[PDB]
Design a protein around this ligand. Structure first.
Ligand SMILES: *Cc1c(COP(=O)(O)O)cnc(C)c1O
Ligand SMILES: *Cc1c(COP(=O)(O)O)cnc(C)c1O
Ligand SMILES: NCC1(CC(=O)O)CCCCC1
Ligand SMILES: NCC1(CC(=O)O)CCCCC1
Ligand SMILES: [Mg+2]
Lengths: 358, 356
């Protein structure tokens, strides 16, 4: 029972550094010169955190992360603002979610402040990788895995916490969605509300089946009434005129099968803040969708996430039929506004608690 | 696909001493392992049988981030005639292959993989315990080693096999039944040995442990269907609602993993023909109602690690529900255990075993 502390950081600089890429960058493909690694054991607990040259992990073949998916991750960004100050966006929320995930995965808890500071140091050393752009950023990937060498399924007595850095650009460009009720992403009583690796491996089949039909992503449906939950691995937002005739920004509620995105939260806070229209966390089914469509009640639909921020949807292939979404034929005003707002806050073109400097 | 004919063998320079057959499941490993690299641009590399060593993986490998991984479990047994046998190995190759497809991992020639495994076990054959109550556990593992963080079909992967001598896993177990957690769901992948299905079980499993139990009784649906005993297929031996003696186990509707042991037990039950054999749904209420009527005789889980694992108690709604398995023999559990072990250790010759 304890934690590692940033003041104990053991930094080992890379002798040979790599050349930065061109800001104009396939997501998660390029990695910086250094990484963060912290060992753990139930015997001695957390060791001293290390910032060393990016290298391969040396894992026992029996590591529980390779057999029973004892792992979890996070994804946040650092932005080199217009005032050229490197900033983090709502990092503390990422530390809160990662912690909640480590517990749900039975992985060893840690001090969020210490980790966030270790991440600060790691990004500081490689601050030059933070894209000298305004449409690019630095992707931060915290990863927690069980390295228990035994094959028995149980709480790991060994784990490794690491952080990778990758400069990224994009990921508008409306997307087509593949809606097949035969596949379910999360279930009540499952781990769909956590960022645990196990919830992602089983979706590759659906994804491939998605591209096989010109769709860039999967629209995850759930239950008898086919509630629409998430766009691929992005939270789903629906801007429309509800059943009562009111202008509304809707999104599925956090009832266990939806991941509580940091971007989802921010979009909700902004929406409430403006008070220009009803904001509701409610259930949305395909029928609610189609009925609204054949009434011209829909305006926009988009997914939200750290990677895309705001990703417009234009089509849903459902029951062998392409259902068009007027998202683009309506601006998308709401979606563009939200992008500007967050972008302004991310790159320093506007002050707000949501960001941190260093 | 890789060919067993291209195996590159690098024997360990120093051999480890064999453990006492005592043995804690999957904690001791043999001298060698099988590794086969795959890439999207070149396909499979040649298979390597080399000394047990750590895996050097790029920190971005999808197996660490998105659970792009699956695994298998089977055993080698030293016969009473000293012949080492594999039990239904081709069924594991089949299941592993199906899982590979559902996981979007590269396909391989089932027969070639088996031959590579046979050769690995042959090299470390002295590890196959000289006991009729111990065996050599075989762990084929398939992981995606895609370097990029984008979520997609891997362009790089690794297939490896570890060997581990093991003893047990009748020590009746008590199960913890809490509907709040769900092992797998319709539309899911609970019918595959993909890593993802296990990581989410640890929280419930630990809750079962600090609550006086050793395994989780996985419940599903509004009517609380009893699906599996921990990660072992569930069997109920009783007199059903029609008053018929019956051996029942949940149907393969998608939330149940098709265990080889499960299929074998059903096979044996059907051929003995001494009672009704049913692949059907079983709910906590069917169970409790049956207990009150004294219709339950036995309950046990089945799996490679524990061929037959009897259940004695179930903590359900704030109460401990006793299952009379042990005071009923357990006649059928024993008979079944006896039969299967006799086949595995060669006391009986059957097509379910492959020698050397
Ligand atoms: C990571 C993730 C999101 C988005 O969360 P953000 O913190 O907003 O990046 C949404 N859905 C799923 C399933 C996710 O894994
Ligand atoms: C492996 C496994 C079983 C048992 O299958 P066998 O082929 O008999 O070893 C049962 N349930 C789950 C969830 C499993 O992973
Ligand atoms: N849809 C993508 C992410 C989330 C996001 O940033 O929207 C989750 C899977 C791993 C890559 C990131
Ligand atoms: N219940 C156990 C296993 C199966 C078995 O052999 O019963 C699956 C999880 C990994 C260890 C093996
Ligand atoms: Mg062939």
């Amino acid at each position: 029972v304890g934690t590692f502390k940033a003041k104990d950081l053991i930094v080992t600089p890379a002798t040979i550094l790599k050349e930065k890429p061109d800001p104009n960058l396939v997501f998660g493909t390029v990695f910086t010169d250094h990484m963060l690694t912290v060992e753990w054991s139930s015997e001695f607990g957390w060791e001293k955190p290390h910032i060393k040259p990016l290298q391969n992990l040396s894992l026992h073949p029996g590591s529980s992360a390779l057999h029973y998916a004892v792992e979890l991750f996070e994804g946040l960004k650092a932005f080199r603002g217009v005032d050229n100050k490197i900033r983090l966006f709502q990092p503390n929320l990422n530390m809160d979610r990662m912690y909640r995930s480590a517990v749900r995965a039975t992985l060893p808890v840690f001090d969020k402040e210490e980790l966030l500071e270790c991440i600060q140091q790691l990004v500081k050393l490689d601050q030059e990788w933070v894209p000298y752009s305004t449409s690019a950023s630095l992707y931060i990937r915290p990863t927690f895995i069980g390295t228990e060498p035994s094959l028995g399924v149980k709480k790991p007595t060994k784990a490794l916490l690491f952080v990778l850095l990758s400069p990224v650009g994009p990921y508008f460009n409306p997307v087509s969605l593949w809606a097949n009720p035969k596949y379910v992403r999360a279930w009540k009583g499952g781990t769909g509300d956590c960022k645990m690796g196990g919830n992602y491996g089983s979706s590759l089949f659906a994804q491939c089946e998605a591209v096989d039909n010109g769709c860039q992503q999967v629209l995850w449906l759930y239950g008898e009434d086919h509630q629409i939950t998430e766009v691929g691995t992005m939270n789903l937002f629906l801007y429309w005129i509800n059943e009562d005739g009111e202008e509304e920004l809707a999104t599925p509620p956090l009832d266990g099968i939806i991941l509580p995105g940091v971007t989802r939260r921010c979009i909700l806070d902004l929406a409430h803040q403006w008070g220009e229209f009803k904001v509701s966390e409610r259930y949305l089914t395909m029928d609610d969708l189609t009925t609204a469509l054949e009434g011209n009640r829909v305006r926009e639909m988009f997914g939200s996430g750290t990677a895309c921020v705001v990703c417009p949807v234009s089509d849903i292939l459902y029951k062998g039929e392409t259902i068009h979404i007027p998202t683009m034929e309506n601006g998308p005003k709401l979606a563009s506004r939200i992008l500007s707002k967050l972008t302004d806050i991310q790159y320093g073109r506007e002050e707000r608690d949501w960001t941190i400097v260093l």
